[PDB]
Amino acid sequence: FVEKCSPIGVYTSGKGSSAAGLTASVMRDPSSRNFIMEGGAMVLADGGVVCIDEFDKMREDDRVAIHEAMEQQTISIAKAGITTTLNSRCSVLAAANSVFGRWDETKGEDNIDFMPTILSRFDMIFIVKDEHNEERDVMLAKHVITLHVSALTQTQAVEGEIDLAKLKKFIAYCRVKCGPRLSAEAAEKLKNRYIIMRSGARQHERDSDRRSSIPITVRQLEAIVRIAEALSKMKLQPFATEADVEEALRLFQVSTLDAALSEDQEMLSRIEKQLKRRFAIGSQVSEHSIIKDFTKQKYPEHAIHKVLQLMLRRGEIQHRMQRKVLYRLK
Amino acid sequence: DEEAEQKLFSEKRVELLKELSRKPDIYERLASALAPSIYEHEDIKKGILLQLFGGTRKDFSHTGRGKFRAEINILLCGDPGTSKSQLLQYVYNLVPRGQYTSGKGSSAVGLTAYVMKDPETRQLVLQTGALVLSDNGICCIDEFDKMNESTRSVLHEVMEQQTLSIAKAGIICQLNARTSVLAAANPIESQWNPKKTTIENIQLPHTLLSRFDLIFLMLDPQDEAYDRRLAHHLVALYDMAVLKDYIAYAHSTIMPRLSEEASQALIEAYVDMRKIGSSRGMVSAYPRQLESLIRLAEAHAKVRLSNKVEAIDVEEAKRLHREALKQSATDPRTGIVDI
Amino acid sequence: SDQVPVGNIPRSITVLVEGENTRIAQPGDHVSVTGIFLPILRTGFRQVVQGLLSETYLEAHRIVKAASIAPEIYGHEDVKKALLLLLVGGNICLMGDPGVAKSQLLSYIDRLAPRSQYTTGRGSSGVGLTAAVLRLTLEGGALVLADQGVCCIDEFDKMAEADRTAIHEVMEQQTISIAKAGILTTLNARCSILAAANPPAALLSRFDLLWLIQDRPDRDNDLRLAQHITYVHQHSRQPPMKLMRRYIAMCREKQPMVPESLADYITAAYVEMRREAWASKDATYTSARTLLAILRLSTALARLRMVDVVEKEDVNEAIRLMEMSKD
Amino acid sequence: RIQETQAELPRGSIPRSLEVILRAEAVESAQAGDKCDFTGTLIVVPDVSKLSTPGARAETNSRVSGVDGYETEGIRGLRALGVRDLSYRLVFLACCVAPTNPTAESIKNQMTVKEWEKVFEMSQDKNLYHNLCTSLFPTIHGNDEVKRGVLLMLFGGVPKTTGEGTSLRGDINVCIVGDPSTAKSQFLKHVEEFSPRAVYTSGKASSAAGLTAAVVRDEESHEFVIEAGALMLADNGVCCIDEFDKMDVRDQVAIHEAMEQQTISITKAGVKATLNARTSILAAANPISGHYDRSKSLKQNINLSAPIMSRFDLFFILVDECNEVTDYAIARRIVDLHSRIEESIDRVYSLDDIRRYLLFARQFKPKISKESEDFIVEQYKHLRQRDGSGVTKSSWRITVRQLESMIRLSEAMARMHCCDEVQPKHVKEAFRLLNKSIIRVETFSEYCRISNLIVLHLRKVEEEEDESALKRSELVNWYLKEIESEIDSEEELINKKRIIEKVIHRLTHYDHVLIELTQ
Amino acid sequence: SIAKIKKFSKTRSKDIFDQLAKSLAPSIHGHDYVKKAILCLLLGGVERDLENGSHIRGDINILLIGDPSVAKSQLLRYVLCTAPRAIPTTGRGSSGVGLTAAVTTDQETGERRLEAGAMVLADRGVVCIDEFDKMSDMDRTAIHEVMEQGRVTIAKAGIHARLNARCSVLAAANPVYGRYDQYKTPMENIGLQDSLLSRFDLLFIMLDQMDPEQDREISDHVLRMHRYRAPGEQDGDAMTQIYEKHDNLLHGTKKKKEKMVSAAFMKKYIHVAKIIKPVLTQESATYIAEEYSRLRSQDSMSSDTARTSPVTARTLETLIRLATAHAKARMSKTVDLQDAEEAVELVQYAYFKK
Amino acid sequence: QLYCDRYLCDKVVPGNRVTIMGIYSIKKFGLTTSRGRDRVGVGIRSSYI
Numbered sequence A: 001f002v003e004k005c006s007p008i009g010v011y012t013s014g015k016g017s018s019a020a021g022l023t024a025s026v027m028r029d030p031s032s033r034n035f036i037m038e039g040g041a042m043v044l045a046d047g048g049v050v051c052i053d054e055f056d057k058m059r060e061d062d063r064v065a066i067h068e069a070m071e072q073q074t075i076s077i078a079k080a081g082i083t084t085t086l087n088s089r090c091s092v093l094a095a096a097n098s099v100f101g102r103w104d105e106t107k108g109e110d111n112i113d114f115m116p117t118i119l120s121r122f123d124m125i126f127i128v129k130d131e132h133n134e135e136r137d138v139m140l141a142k143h144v145i146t147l148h149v150s151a152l153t154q155t156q157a158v159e160g161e162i163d164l165a166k167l168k169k170f171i172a173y174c175r176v177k178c179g180p181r182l183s184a185e186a187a188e189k190l191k192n193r194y195i196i197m198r199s200g201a202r203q204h205e206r207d208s209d210r211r212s213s214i215p216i217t218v219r220q221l222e223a224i225v226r227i228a229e230a231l232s233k234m235k236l237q238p239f240a241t242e243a244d245v246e247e248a249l250r251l252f253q254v255s256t257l258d259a260a261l262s263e264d265q266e267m268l269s270r271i272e273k274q275l276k277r278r279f280a281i282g283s284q285v286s287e288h289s290i291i292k293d294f295t296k297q298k299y300p301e302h303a304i305h306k307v308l309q310l311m312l313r314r315g316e317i318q319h320r321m322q323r324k325v326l327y328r329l330k
Numbered sequence B: 001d002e003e004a005e006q007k008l009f010s011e012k013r014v015e016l017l018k019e020l021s022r023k024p025d026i027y028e029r030l031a032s033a034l035a036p037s038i039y040e041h042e043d044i045k046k047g048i049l050l051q052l053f054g055g056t057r058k059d060f061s062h063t064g065r066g067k068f069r070a071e072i073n074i075l076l077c078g079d080p081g082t083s084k085s086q087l088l089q090y091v092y093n094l095v096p097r098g099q100y101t102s103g104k105g106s107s108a109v110g111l112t113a114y115v116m117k118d119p120e121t122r123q124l125v126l127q128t129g130a131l132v133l134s135d136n137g138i139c140c141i142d143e144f145d146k147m148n149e150s151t152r153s154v155l156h157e158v159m160e161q162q163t164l165s166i167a168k169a170g171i172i173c174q175l176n177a178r179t180s181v182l183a184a185a186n187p188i189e190s191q192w193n194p195k196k197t198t199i200e201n202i203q204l205p206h207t208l209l210s211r212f213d214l215i216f217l218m219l220d221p222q223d224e225a226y227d228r229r230l231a232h233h234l235v236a237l238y239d240m241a242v243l244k245d246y247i248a249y250a251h252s253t254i255m256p257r258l259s260e261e262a263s264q265a266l267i268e269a270y271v272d273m274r275k276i277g278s279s280r281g282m283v284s285a286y287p288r289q290l291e292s293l294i295r296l297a298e299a300h301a302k303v304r305l306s307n308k309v310e311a312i313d314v315e316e317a318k319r320l321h322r323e324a325l326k327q328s329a330t331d332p333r334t335g336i337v338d339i
Numbered sequence C: 001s002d003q004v005p006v007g008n009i010p011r012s013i014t015v016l017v018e019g020e021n022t023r024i025a026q027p028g029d030h031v032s033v034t035g036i037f038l039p040i041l042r043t044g045f046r047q048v049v050q051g052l053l054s055e056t057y058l059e060a061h062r063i064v065k066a067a068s069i070a071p072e073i074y075g076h077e078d079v080k081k082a083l084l085l086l087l088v089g090g091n092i093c094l095m096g097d098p099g100v101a102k103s104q105l106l107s108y109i110d111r112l113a114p115r116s117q118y119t120t121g122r123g124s125s126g127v128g129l130t131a132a133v134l135r136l137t138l139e140g141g142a143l144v145l146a147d148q149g150v151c152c153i154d155e156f157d158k159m160a161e162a163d164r165t166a167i168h169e170v171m172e173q174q175t176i177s178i179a180k181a182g183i184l185t186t187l188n189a190r191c192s193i194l195a196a197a198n199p200p201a202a203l204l205s206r207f208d209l210l211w212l213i214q215d216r217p218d219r220d221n222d223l224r225l226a227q228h229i230t231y232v233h234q235h236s237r238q239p240p241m242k243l244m245r246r247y248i249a250m251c252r253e254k255q256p257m258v259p260e261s262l263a264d265y266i267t268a269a270y271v272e273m274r275r276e277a278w279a280s281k282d283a284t285y286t287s288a289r290t291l292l293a294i295l296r297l298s299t300a301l302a303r304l305r306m307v308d309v310v311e312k313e314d315v316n317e318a319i320r321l322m323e324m325s326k327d
Numbered sequence D: 001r002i003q004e005t006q007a008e009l010p011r012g013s014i015p016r017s018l019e020v021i022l023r024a025e026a027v028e029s030a031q032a033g034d035k036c037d038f039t040g041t042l043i044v045v046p047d048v049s050k051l052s053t054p055g056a057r058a059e060t061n062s063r064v065s066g067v068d069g070y071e072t073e074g075i076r077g078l079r080a081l082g083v084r085d086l087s088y089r090l091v092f093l094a095c096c097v098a099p100t101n102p103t104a105e106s107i108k109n110q111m112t113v114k115e116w117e118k119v120f121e122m123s124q125d126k127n128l129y130h131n132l133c134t135s136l137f138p139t140i141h142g143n144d145e146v147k148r149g150v151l152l153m154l155f156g157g158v159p160k161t162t163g164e165g166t167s168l169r170g171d172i173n174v175c176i177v178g179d180p181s182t183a184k185s186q187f188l189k190h191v192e193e194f195s196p197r198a199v200y201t202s203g204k205a206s207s208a209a210g211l212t213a214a215v216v217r218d219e220e221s222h223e224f225v226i227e228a229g230a231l232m233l234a235d236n237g238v239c240c241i242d243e244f245d246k247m248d249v250r251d252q253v254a255i256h257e258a259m260e261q262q263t264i265s266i267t268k269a270g271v272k273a274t275l276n277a278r279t280s281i282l283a284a285a286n287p288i289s290g291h292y293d294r295s296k297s298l299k300q301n302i303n304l305s306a307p308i309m310s311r312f313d314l315f316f317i318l319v320d321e322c323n324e325v326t327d328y329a330i331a332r333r334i335v336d337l338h339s340r341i342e343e344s345i346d347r348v349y350s351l352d353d354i355r356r357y358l359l360f361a362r363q364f365k366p367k368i369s370k371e372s373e374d375f376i377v378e379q380y381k382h383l384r385q386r387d388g389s390g391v392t393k394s395s396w397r398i399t400v401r402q403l404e405s406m407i408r409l410s411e412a413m414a415r416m417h418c419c420d421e422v423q424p425k426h427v428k429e430a431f432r433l434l435n436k437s438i439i440r441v442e443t444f445s446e447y448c449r450i451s452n453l454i455v456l457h458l459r460k461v462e463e464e465e466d467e468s469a470l471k472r473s474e475l476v477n478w479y480l481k482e483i484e485s486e487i488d489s490e491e492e493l494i495n496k497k498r499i500i501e502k503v504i505h506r507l508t509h510y511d512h513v514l515i516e517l518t519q
Numbered sequence E: 001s002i003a004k005i006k007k008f009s010k011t012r013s014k015d016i017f018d019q020l021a022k023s024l025a026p027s028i029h030g031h032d033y034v035k036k037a038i039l040c041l042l043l044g045g046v047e048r049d050l051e052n053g054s055h056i057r058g059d060i061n062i063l064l065i066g067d068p069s070v071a072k073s074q075l076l077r078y079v080l081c082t083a084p085r086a087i088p089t090t091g092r093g094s095s096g097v098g099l100t101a102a103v104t105t106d107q108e109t110g111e112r113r114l115e116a117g118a119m120v121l122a123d124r125g126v127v128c129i130d131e132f133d134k135m136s137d138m139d140r141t142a143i144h145e146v147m148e149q150g151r152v153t154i155a156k157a158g159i160h161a162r163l164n165a166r167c168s169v170l171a172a173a174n175p176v177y178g179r180y181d182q183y184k185t186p187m188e189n190i191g192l193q194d195s196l197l198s199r200f201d202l203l204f205i206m207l208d209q210m211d212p213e214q215d216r217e218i219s220d221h222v223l224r225m226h227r228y229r230a231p232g233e234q235d236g237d238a239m240t241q242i243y244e245k246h247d248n249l250l251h252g253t254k255k256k257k258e259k260m261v262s263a264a265f266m267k268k269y270i271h272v273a274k275i276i277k278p279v280l281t282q283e284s285a286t287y288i289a290e291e292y293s294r295l296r297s298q299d300s301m302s303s304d305t306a307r308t309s310p311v312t313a314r315t316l317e318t319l320i321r322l323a324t325a326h327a328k329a330r331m332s333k334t335v336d337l338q339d340a341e342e343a344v345e346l347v348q349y350a351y352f353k354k
Numbered sequence F: 001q002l003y004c005d006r007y008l009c010d011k012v013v014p015g016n017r018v019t020i021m022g023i024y025s026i027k028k029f030g031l032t033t034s035r036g037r038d039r040v041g042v043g044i045r046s047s048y049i
């Protein structure tokens, strides 16, 4: 949808596409001596949006080049008798899969394979999980079937949708027309919040005694700045207000801080640590006994159920002939 | 060319050589006369002489087996601080139709034959390589370890079938490569480490090793008499025609043949060799060693100017085969050479 | 390379040579040529610009082609003596820690020798060594050019295996053999090799002399080295070649000989040396090659003295040099 | 184009190539790959670009000189005097072409009465199966299975086509893997000598264009001509490949394409063409380690791709015994070859007679009888049942490809014996050979059987009841109670009890197959 | 593609390099040592030749290692913009052949021709290498020839040449563990051999310490730069004096007591200083030699801290080179003791870490 | 093959999907003799739009 909506947009996966690379290359024609350059997926877009599936499969050369492409928006290529610098002013929108194939909440870190260097360049990081909600599945199924039924007759799902052509032209118009900048009063509040967030991150790192895989740097501060500026630009205003910065900080918290801080998870870790000691290898325990023991400790039952489900997925816990009593394997 | 014509008018020389052959020590004398400026290694020189004489070129086309290799291939494995290179140089300079290759310097296409086009005329489809130019001659290979598997693939067929098959675009042919190989090799560590076994020291596939008739494991005993003799000889460094005529006459005038006594001696030698080489750690034996024994016996029969191979020749061949590999001093159940 | 401007590439010219001037110059030589600059009228493929164009060429009429070794470098006196002996003649390898000037000694050796070549590594690898066919004539590499001279190789351990095998063949057999598609030749290379490297049995077994340069941080030696370097950088001259070339040329004219009696003495020494090597189980190599190297060094020293008969002092100095190198 | 044969080569010389020209009726004969005698003339034909340097040339005898303004300079003078360069080349014109050594009715008519008598005498001998084995391979000792397989491959099966447009293979492919010096290349050389149309190639010597085909331009006309490769010259013959592992993987891909489609497709130099390659492949390969590992399956001992591995009809494995009496029996033969150059051979049929009989035999296309259908069905059923878990692992695993191979081998046997239909004897022989080719892995059976029985009992207990289960002592007691009718004395009973207890301990602790829980 | 300079130099002396280091790049916050080192590259040493044809290197080389977002690439880009002959060549962007040179057979004539690489084109210039750690080993072995002697030897049968490649190198490499580990010694983090480290004149390590006041300063600077708009451009729109005019945002109210040097005058002064040829004095030679001996003895005394780079003979040449660069900074005729002291301070800071 | 004159040049980039209105014609460079080793075709003029 982003590829279709933006005036300029390229959709690619890792390793490029069918017959087009992800980064540009340079060759020399032997017959007639001309320096030919082949357009890559990044060079072909200027001011557009590049959607990238399968972020994990990239090759080494492209992985190294994308660092400069994301940071300085330029690529530098030198060969015998030639040195060139190409422009690539692209926004990046990437999707990736879990390391183990599905997310493991209790493991926390190590669910992401990317080194912190590449993760630093991103502005916002979203984490999505298949969350168990019995009554939400009914609504999702009904929504899907309603969409399938209504696709045949009327493309009028919502009363006030902007038409795709109108939305495209309006986005282009706003992008070309004006450009906003921050305000000092909002700037000071942003500074204070950023200092507080950095202090909290350092405190979390020192208390947990582990290096954070998703750090908070100056680039994230500039990311919040850029998001606020974009929100201001959406209204054609030359200067932003406090509300824009507040919304930007809310979004930044919801995405990045929830990604980096990944009491519920710590409490689940406590339950796992307790169970590992309590569970006797080569012995059986009734689920009712565990439920009673942990509810007398006043821990929620849903956490215990989720921990048991995760152990079942890992394979340490197995059911007997009757599901009332479980036993421990390795 | 000259051997295939009756140019032995020198009846005086014929009588002199035929009288010399009846003397007992002439064998050793030949081993002495093969190289005056080379050291006490008489076994190596005897092996080279037997290589020079060569086995009988029998005809087996009626059998359908194909060509039978009648020549001798020898290997010398040792540290670089020895005189194997000088031996290869002397053999190259002594025998006509000689070629010399060294390590990675040659390629697979460099040997056999390669496709060309004339710089003066339109075409010259194929041009011979190092091995074919060595047909009916001697090829000396040095630094045999560094050669890649691609060239060893060629050597596998060359060393046994005596023929080469080439099949490329518009070029399908079979060529004759009836050469004799003198190969030199080094230990993997450039030292003969006594803790490792012989096979581990050499590090060559058994298929390639089995085709060598004789293998000489050069070792340093550090004997005082050896040091004194070699020092005196080297510091003191500061009839060829008769040998030539004798070698040509023997090589061109006698066809060795063997009786049942030699047959049974060869069979006994074969079963004894199989018994000895069964134990792991040492180089195992294969049926081609029997043919190697036959070839050495025929060469020794040629040395004595005899058309009949006697049990003496077979016993001498067995002695050389045993001594070359140093199987007597080697520990049969650990594969470690001792002194 | 001195006259090339900044960032450009050397230009080439073509010379034609007449009867007696023929057979004077060889590839790789530095020459001075007295010539006439004349054009050649060219008729051939059509061109953009009308008129009479031509190609230029030069018609020649005449072509013209112990002591201190590298006094700028402080220390290494014994290594300098060994270098002198190698230059005079009858293969030396240096292994050293980084920061010790091994490359500059090889550069000095290249500049001093009449016929010399200097290689730096993979830049001259492959076809830069051995020889290749070009439009047909066969053109040689650095080893071929340095025939009957001295060759210098830097960063020896970083070379490809094929180059090292070729170098070993040159050192031991003194000829190169090439058998590839289009080339089937044996090349004559009667040159002695000096090699430099960073920290194997191959070097000990194949080479004659190895010099290990270890940087032990002694205060006095380091302070003297610092003083020497400051002197060099400030006064542009060491603290207080043509003659050396003439002396070497005069020296190489003679050929001493070994008498019969001294053999016994030499023999005794050799035996005793080996016995000591057999006593010290930590020792690595002794063989007749060491005796040959000692004889060659003694003959070189006798040649330096211009004596017809080898003497005792030369043998003692060769023994001392080998002992110093081994230690 | 013709080439000088190998037997005429002098020392270190490449064979000479010559051009032959056929006119009118003689044009038909002399196909590519033949070995023929020519009778004709040797004739001189002019050439153009031979002389890069001036040579002999012609001119006119008239004493003519130029005139001012028309002086006989270079070009005009040469054109006026009619100067031509005398360049020539040697060309052979053929008037008679014959084979060097010489549609079933046509073959029968070609043979004379004595040749037909010999063929009929050969036809009705059972020893034809035996004597052909010894005739083609007199010197090689043992390995009669390989000889029988090679003969069956030589005779071959019958190709067929279906109504849907598909085609079915009629050829047989054979592979030999063995330890060093087990006469592995001798079979290849003997088949190369015997067959009239056979090509022997090593793995690395032959290039991709050396096989398949090449396309070049005609000298005179605008058309194109095709240079045949090894597979095309061996069409409807045998191709021998030694050192099969050394071939490039892409060359192996091309070989597999030729084995499956039996067609070579060329799209080059403006020419699109399809050519038939109905070859039978005999290949020799070495083990990965240089020796066969008895403890591993065939797929783990050879570096060959799965498709080409499945395409081969028969695999033969040779292993050298260390110190058996055969070492004597081998030696007696080898010296017999050296002591007796030619008198140590007792061939029954000459090679020419065998070639004639093979040519006659390959024409037959026997059908499949009705009883043979059920016999083959039941034999394939038994073969597949052999793969059951009651016996040790085998090197192969049996699929429908084995059934098709059995049918092909039955057709080959019928062709060899010249019978008009496939009969149960041939089916039995093919079944025997295919079973003997299969080798069982040697490392144990009793331990596996006991473990399987215990697993069966425990899982039956688990599945049959939602109630409580048994313990280790209960399992031991149950197994002993079941054995009760099989052990006659207390000593055997206690020994088996100790053995089963140790086995159960190993299963629970070492193998982790069975789980143990506390009270 | 005179009075002002003389007056400014003669009046300022030390303040010349002081302000030049301070006013190197307002867009980058802090890191005085790296600015000093970059200025030393810009000024450079002195090339020297002797009677025997011996060549002595005069170029400087630097390697920076730091945590992400410490603005190493910004520094590289600024050096690219300011330096006259600057070429950027990242790790895997250019291989060993495209770095130095190559030989090609001309099909038109059959002769052999030489094609220059990146380092040969940058004669007496600057090559910037971003992501230096990703470069392969063979490329670094090739760069050895340029870094040691400044020449490239090329040979293929039919032609051989020695091309000039005198050059200076900037390099930035990430730590092996993604982020620099404090407890482990720098040798484990860098993961480079001693020879390559000795090839470089300077090593620097940069860290992102999360001090609340330092973070406040960084945020202030970044947002001041962000809010700034070019004069003469209307708000909301889309898209020579020696000392720069004071700016309310780019400089600040407190900085009114000092000023920054204009870019154009800075370039002119840099060129003039690069022209000037200073000479070493007798006062400082013994002083530098004694301090080199002191460092090589302190090798045993430095027990509380580890060493980033080994101390070899190249360190003394580096000392002299940095002294001459500082003497170039302030236009004069001879090298004095203060330049030696500054060089030694730089060496002490770079060569050891806590 | 298409012929473009004057202002029609550079209006189309390779890879575009275009609809073109034109005149179907043949080249006219005199009555030249056929070339090459193939001379089967008689009276064939190369066509274009």
Ligand SMILES: Nc1ncnc2c1ncn2[C@@H]1O[C@H](COP(=O)(O)OP(=O)(O)O)[C@@H](O)[C@H]1O
Pocket: C072, C073, C074, C075, C096, C097, C098, C099, C100, C101, C102, C103, C104, C225, C229, E148, E313, E314
């Ligand atoms: N003994 C010495 N005397 C004078 N200068 C030295 C000495 N040892 C080293 N140097 C200096 O140190 C540098 C060593 O660099 P280089 O010789 O290239 O090292 P390597 O040869 O080990 O690569 C040289 O530039 C040289 O000026």
Ligand SMILES: Nc1ncnc2c1ncn2[C@@H]1O[C@H](COP(=O)(O)OP(=O)(O)O)[C@@H](O)[C@H]1O
Pocket: B160, B287, B288, D139, D140, D141, D142, D179, D180, D181, D182, D183, D184, D185, D186, D330, D333, D334
């Ligand atoms: N069973 C056998 N009978 C007769 N000769 C044999 C036998 N096995 C081996 N040989 C002899 O040993 C040699 C084996 O070499 P070869 O068959 O080329 O080995 P491979 O084919 O494994 O490379 C042949 O020359 C053959 O004469």
Ligand SMILES: Nc1ncnc2c1ncn2[C@@H]1O[C@H](COP(=O)(O)OP(=O)(O)O)[C@@H](O)[C@H]1O
Pocket: A071, A218, A219, E027, E028, E029, E030, E067, E068, E069, E070, E071, E072, E073, E074, E221, E222
């Ligand atoms: N000291 C500093 N002063 C100003 N901005 C900085 C500083 N350090 C980091 N930044 C900001 O952080 C970003 C770092 O990006 P980059 O230079 O690519 O980091 P790296 O080169 O370490 O990957 C820059 O956009 C820069 O604006």
Ligand SMILES: [Mg+2]
Pocket: C102, C103, C154, E148
């Ligand atoms: Mg060096």
Ligand SMILES: [Mg+2]
Pocket: D184, D185, D242
């Ligand atoms: Mg074989």
Ligand SMILES: [Mg+2]
Pocket: A071, E072, E073
């Ligand atoms: Mg960066």
